[PDB]
Design a binder for these strands. Structure first.
Ligand SMILES: [Ca+2]
Ligand SMILES: [Ca+2]
Ligand SMILES: [Ca+2]
Ligand SMILES: [Ca+2]
Ligand SMILES: [Zn+2]
Ligand SMILES: [Zn+2]
Lengths: 550, 351, 542, 351
DNA sequence: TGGAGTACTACCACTGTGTAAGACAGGCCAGATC
DNA sequence: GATCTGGCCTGTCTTACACAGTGGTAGTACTCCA
DNA sequence: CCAGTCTGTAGCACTGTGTAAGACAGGCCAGATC
DNA sequence: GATCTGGCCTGTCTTACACAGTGCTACAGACTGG
């Protein structure tokens, strides 16, 4: 029994086998046992051209704004025809990308099998559910710095690279009555690199706003011009319509500041969504309304620039409330579920350090007492919870610290039992309200913690500003204001927190490194093209399906 | 003529290939910080100083009546002769921001108060342009003229982005020479006018202009249409025959064939040109001199200081003029490793 | 279905990791399976009949200083160094086989082809089964920059030709001559050490056991169950496949550009200026022992340089016996380098200008690269590889270069020189000269003589008293060694050096990674990549 | 009692951990070096010059009537004191060849001629041994004794490779201690006689022994049999009666747990035992001082010169005495890339 | 009995463009005795 | 103060040391089918 | 219905690689001062 | 009027960790025959 060509394309890409490698084992297994078990190279390459962008014909009505209606374009150079005149800004930055719309229709037609499956399950009459489709899209843009390609004799900036990736979150139906939504397809794990398709790759640092904007501008214009109109796709034998909504979440707070204009980083304006300062985050730690939006930030930047009230410098910065740079991409600034603990972890570490030691009787401590309290606390954790000390709170250490075991263990040193029960109740409310943001969907998994979260965080903040008022006078770490002021509003506005984290690209960093390692053409201008082609071939639902793993 | 290797003691990561250098009331200011204005400086207009051969950079502050300028990269600079009302001023319009677009907004910058303790306060008033406004562009040039006897300004040249019809995200960054029309700006109000002549057969870019006695000479910069560098110096004489701004132009014989040239004023109407780029691969190396009067432009090839190998061999370079005969040039200090201070600075002086 | 051995071949002949092969096997089984590949745990024992330490054997008489347990495998290269800090530290990490077990595994692997040679020769297979003869070519080359380089050293050998002398009355019958000793597909590793290449101390203190069992195996004979019979074997060791520097370092000559150039003849440098053809090949291992003894004990009360000259540059007791012959590949590289220098010199002028400066030679090299890229489409390189040499040796390179020479006499002269060189080059490069091209070897003496006299006459500006050593070797020893040692080039260190990229790639896709284990598994793979069994199952009838 | 960080300007690649430092007629000669004798100096021995904390290594040259020495690695050294009729000698025996092999040869080294211009000629004689010769060993100790009234040499200790039958190619670079036999060697004739010790029930190695007026003191060292470091010092007494050189011994009660030490002579019979290793990982940092009396050993601990962090963190260290209360110790250095002078040097003095 | 479609094996672009040791020639210089 | 010479310097010369392996492209054997 | 037995998958030792939290420091303004 | 040091703010090194893969090993489960 022969083997399908697509199966073999998947079994090549999914195990990083090189062309020469595959061909060698191919001729081997063919001449070995009397059969054409695998398919040869060129037929696999021809049969793969179905999955890359630029193969399926589509349409857009109304037509897109300032976007070519060609559908046969493939891997374009992100320069976008940068005039190469030396006198002008240099044009050496390497970058390759897809034409956003083409890649999007390719990924949609890939998911077409599952959307038809969902239409079979939902029993919606296929000749009727034609136009009312709607797709949610996440897009994460992190700069994977300092890659080492292992063959460097002359510096060709082969270290940093920004990887603009997108992922289809969920596709629903809209026809035809009220029926505002039926989730025909909800991707099951939207955080892993198996489903995080690259769109644009650039050999630059995430620092210089100049090159980053210069090469992302086309992608921003596509994101904008693709918000209104409808995409016409020949899917399942029917000319069907699709409307989009682009929830852009997976940015690091650094990049969110860089693209919302907020002065970075440890400014007087901590939260990206509310306008409150540090002192206004310390006075009231619960009641806040998420206000910052792309359009309002644009208007604020106009206010700052023109200064229509001729107010002084610092007063103008306070009246604009953090907006000093013109934003250039509408971003949905959700809480980052990646850390989501590390700030809380180091805050509980400082609280234990200052609770075993006496800070609310002796107000001003010196270096020696602080370091001694840290030493004895770490020795206590080694004694009872069996945790060695570290310099930085990583993930697993935080996970093993903010547990009732370590807390009731560390309770034995603080003399006043009042403070003992106080901090125990603190950690109790904390670890009760914790899985609200970490887990996938609190609307299905743990609706009780969500329904209680308002009053829970209220009691938490009251306990803090009652028994720890000595420390939250006017300064509060950012993540605490995040977890206390916006969690219910966030999970209500979207439907989850952890299901929009940047985890995708944080994982796919290893994929980029590996594809640069064993599949690169080393020409430094084709290399990106090969990395992109292989990375996309990886993350096509069809090919992972042929990796049944049964 | 002498060169000297300077060193950026601190603030090395705030110099980008394009930038402007302004002078007014003594000290020299650097304009066009890369990135966006950090918390270090509220504005981004730095004050640069050569102290014992080291580049010291301090922050400038603004008054309340002033508006705040985005950090243009390659604006169109124009020094304004000291007279009523605020002597002197500086016209900046409009360059490109840290993001890929153009301001199309003229700004009048000046000094307001001093010191007290060796401090300088600046003001940046927007001057709206009603018209017939000059389209958004970068690398063009603006200059002041006095026509019998009212003071106006002439703007010309500069590339731009393709008009928003064929502007397509596959060539979303391909630029085009703006149509060759001379634009006349009055400062109060900004009633701007557009004019043309058959002598302006084509639009240029990065052509250093020099005005005197309401007569302006445009050097030869560079054109992307024909990919050639017209060495034809362009003379134009205008006057405000009230209320009509009559203009005439003429193709003179010879102008220098160098692009993106630094201009340092030494005398009353005398400018040394350290030169940016002669050939589209081989940069200009010499240092020339331009005088000008009613006789016309007079060119003279001064002695170019012996360029050090590091500056002479590296691909590109740029810079500005610290005024009074001195100027600053900079070369990409690319190699192993990046400090990340990636630009070696050289001061170059005349006589 | 697929035979397990074939699947192991496919695994190690394409550099696939257990994770990769396992995913591939799971996938291809879940679709249309009908199990096609075999899983990991069956290959991880289906190779035990290919690595060392599976096939029983013995010797008669037993080997000296060598335990007779035949089941040993990967052994630590330190050979039991007392780790006591107070002594020289037991620092360097290494691994190896036991030379005897490696040889018996190699032979019992070649079993199929030795039986094929038996049958094809129409010789009886049951009798005449006690006097086989094996020729084993060793090779040992360093290797830098295996990322500070860390400069690991590798030791390999190759069964060159197994012949039979039975039952006598004759000299022998070449049962099987290896067809391709050049390529690494038959160059098997026997010892890997993370030792720098030049430090005598650790190099000797790890190679000692190998050289010991080598010296011990030269006497007795081997017994192997092959072709159903308990047959016997004798070995002869050709220590050829070293480069020049290492041969010197393990020979007792003062490397490398000394006053005593020839590894084989004792002619000094200056004497290698006038005379360039007539020389005698005398340097032998035992003679070097005797000469070093004459140096050390100094029985004639002579002064320093006088005594040095009585022994002809022998001031170090050598230990690893080395047959007196030159490498083939490095001869090419040396020759290529010297012609490149001469070209760089003749683009400018030397016989007209006595002492040109450094910038002049820099510019002459630059313009030579210009002329060799504008035509012949050749790019510059830092160090000259074999390919760049082969290209710099052909005619059209000369027809392009000589264009710049003003003096047409010099043009025709170096053209005729390269003509002579191309007429005499396939003598030592060949696999078997007396069979591939007997006419060049027949005409090599007179050709070398004419070439040497052309050099001495039209280039005496340069060859006053300085001669590169490969020039001397190729102009005075080629005919003698080809007449004596059967052939040359068929004994190139190439098989090691070009094979070394394996140990390069085998550090990426098959690491562990820890030097305690890294050498172990690298050796395992690098061996398993060679056995003719697996190359047969790889080619599978074209 | 202090140290000083020296630097090896050049020739910083010709030292290996175990090496010898012979002190005769002033200047010190370094003996034993990494690799065979290169052609910078064919005789392997280097004169050592200590100037301005700087380490110079000058070439030496032997006589014509002398023999040439392989650079033994960790041999035994016996300073044959000035006596009739050829002062002043050094006895080296038998050491480790740079080619990884032992040598049972006995080299008698001395000085022959000088200068004329500060050049120092040496001579080296192979001394044939008659016996009952001691087999080839390394790490042993040789000393000189003058008993009633003739001079002899006492050889004892040191390891050796396995006997030539049990030495298996897999146990090749293993090593066990030589049999516990003392060897009395006459410089002429070389009738080396072996003798047993009914009390020294075990051999050892790296024991820094001493001799005083035909009475020998084997200080404790390392025994690989039981991995023990027996601090019990060994006294013994020799009487060269005619013609049987009778020997007796005694187990001293307390000594020092020292291994691979440097012995710098201070007084006529006063020595500083400088340092080595007291454990399998711990190095003896504290110095020691031994006066040799006809009553016996007089031991006291001096002030240990403060150890820099560099010398203290190091796994290992070694050295040799420059004489006159001075010595030279070394540390295997680290860093990226190769220095390649991978050994830092500390000069050390007493008083 | 022939056609072209298949598959294989052979090409090409491309990283960077210098090193690290050692022998010997010879210049010459400390420095020390003469 | 004169010599002069052994020892350091500097330069030049010789032997190695890396630079494969990876995708795309196209001739081109060569052969499955009617 | 059950146990061998075979297959798949998880766990272990390991150090090379990127990463970002934290140490710090120095540089400039505020504050106190000359 | 003109100068200087603590606070702190932020730009920089740096280094503890986890994370990557890999071969081996060990256990756990699933198939197949009596
Ligand atoms: Ca980042
Ligand atoms: Ca990141
Ligand atoms: Ca070699
Ligand atoms: Ca080599
Ligand atoms: Zn907020
Ligand atoms: Zn010879």
């Amino acid at each position: 029994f022969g083997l399908h060509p697509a199966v073999c394309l998947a079994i090549r890409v999914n195990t990083f086998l090189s062309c020469s490698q595959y061909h060698k084992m191919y001729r081997t297994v063919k001449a070995t046992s009397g059969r054409q078990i695998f398919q040869p190279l060129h037929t696999l390459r021809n049969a793969e051209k179905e999955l890359l962008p630029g193969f399926h014909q589509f349409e857009w009505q109304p037509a897109l704004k300032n976007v070519s209606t060609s559908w046969d374009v493939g891997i374009i150079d992100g320069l976008s025809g940068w005039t190469v005149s030396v006198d002008d800004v240099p044009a050496d930055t390497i970058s390759r990308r897809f034409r956003y719309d083409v890649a999007l229709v390719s990924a949609l037609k890939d998911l077409e099998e599952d959307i038809m499956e969902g239409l079979r399950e939902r029993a919606l009459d296929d000749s009727m559910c034609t136009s009312g489709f709607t797709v949610v899209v996440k897009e994460s843009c992190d700069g994977m710095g300092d890659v080492s390609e292992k063959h460097g004799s002359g510096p060709a900036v082969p270290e940093k690279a920004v990887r603009f990736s997108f992922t289809i979150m969920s596709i629903s139906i809209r026809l035809e009555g009220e029926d505002d939504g039926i989730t025909i397809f909800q991707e099951q794990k939207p955080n892993s690199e198996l489903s995080c398709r690259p769109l644009c790759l650039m050999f630059v640092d995430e620092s210089d706003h100049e090159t980053l904007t210069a090469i992302l501008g086309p992608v921003v214009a596509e994101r904008k011009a693709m918000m209104e109109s409808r995409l016409i796709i020949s899917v399942g034998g029917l000319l069907r319509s699709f409307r989009f909504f682009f929830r852009g979440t997976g940015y690091d707070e650094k990049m969110v500041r860089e693209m919302e204009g907020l002065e970075a980083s440890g400014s007087t304006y901590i939260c990206t969504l509310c306008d409150s300062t540090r002192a206004e985050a310390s006075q009231n730690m619960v009641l806040h309304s998420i206000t910052r939006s792309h359009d309002e930030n644009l208007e604020r930047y106009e206010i700052w620039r023109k200064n229509p009230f001729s107010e002084s410098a610092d007063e103008l910065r306070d009246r604009v409330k953090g907006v000093s740079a013109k934003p250039f991409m509408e971003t949905q600034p959700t809480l980052d579920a990646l850390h989501c603990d590390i700030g809380n972890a180091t805050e509980f570490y400082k609280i234990f350090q200052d609770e075993i030691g006496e800070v609310y009787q002796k107000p001003n401590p010196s270096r020696e007492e602080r370091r001694r309290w840290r030493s004895t606390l770490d020795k206590q954790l080694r004694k009872k919870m069996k945790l060695k000390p570290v310099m930085r709170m990583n993930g697993n250490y935080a996970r093993r610290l903010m547990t009732r075991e370590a807390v009731e263990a560390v309770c034995e040193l603080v003399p006043s039992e009042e403070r003992r029960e106080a901090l125990l109740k603190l950690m109790d409310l904390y670890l009760q309200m914790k899985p609200v943001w970490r887990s996938t969907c609190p609307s299905r998994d743990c609706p009780d913690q969500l329904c209680q979260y308002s009053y829970n965080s209220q009691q938490f903040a009251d306990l803090l500003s009652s028994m720890f008022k000595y420390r939250y006078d006017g300064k509060i770490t950012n993540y605490l204001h995040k977890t206390l002021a916006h969690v219910p509003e966030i999970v209500e506005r979207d439907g989850s927190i952890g299901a929009w984290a940047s985890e995708g690209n944080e994982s796919g960093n290893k994929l980029f490194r590996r594809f640069r390692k064993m599949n690169a053409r080393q020409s430094k201008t084709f290399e990106l093209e090969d990395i992109l082609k292989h990375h996309w071939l990886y993350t096509s639902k069809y090919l992972q399906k042929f990796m049944e793993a049964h | 003529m002498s060169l000297q290797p300077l060193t950026a003691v601190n603030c090395g990561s705030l110099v980008q290939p394009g930038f402007s250098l302004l002078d007014l009331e003594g000290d020299v200011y650097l304009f066009g910080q890369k990135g966006w204005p950090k918390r270090s400086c509220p504005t981004g207009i730095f004050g640069v100083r050569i102290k014992k051969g080291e580049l010291k950079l301090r922050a400038i502050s603004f008054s309340n009546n002033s508006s705040y300028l985005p950090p243009l990269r390659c604006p169109a600079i124009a020094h304004f002769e000291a007279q009523d009302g605020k002597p002197e001023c500086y016209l900046i319009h409009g360059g490109r921001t840290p993001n890929n677009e153009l301001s199309s907004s003229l700004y009048m910058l000046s000094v307001d108060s001093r010191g007290c303790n060796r401090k300088v306060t600046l003001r940046c008033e927007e001057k709206e342009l009603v018209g017939d406004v000059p389209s958004a562009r970068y690398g063009h040039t603006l200059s002041v003229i006095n026509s019998r006897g009212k003071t106006a300004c002439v703007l010309f040249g500069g590339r731009s982005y393709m008009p928003p019809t064929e502007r397509t995200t596959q060539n979303w960054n391909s630029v085009v020479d703006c149509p060759p029309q001379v634009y006349l700006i009055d400062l109060e109000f900004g009633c701007c006018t557009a004019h043309t002549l058959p002598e302006l057969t084509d639009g240029q870019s990065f052509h250093v202009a020099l005005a005197r006695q309401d007569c302006v000479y445009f050097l030869g910069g560079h054109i992307l249409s024909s990919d050639c560098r017209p060495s034809r110096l362009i003379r134009l004489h205008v006057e405000l025959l009230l209320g009509s701004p009559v203009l005439t132009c003429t193709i003179l014989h010879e102008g220098l064939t160098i692009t993106s040239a630094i201009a340092s004023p030494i005398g009353y109407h005398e400018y040394i040109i350290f030169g940016g780029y002669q050939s589209e691969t081989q940069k200009r190396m010499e240092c020339t001199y331009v005088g000008l009067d009613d006789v016309g432009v007079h060119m003279e090839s001064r002695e170019p200081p012996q360029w050090t190998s590091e500056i002479s061999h590296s691909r590109t370079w740029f810079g500005g003029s610290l005024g009074k005969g001195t100027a600053l040039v900079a070369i990409p200090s690319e190699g192993n490793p990046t400090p990340p201070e990636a630009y070696h600075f050289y001061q170059v002086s005349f006589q």
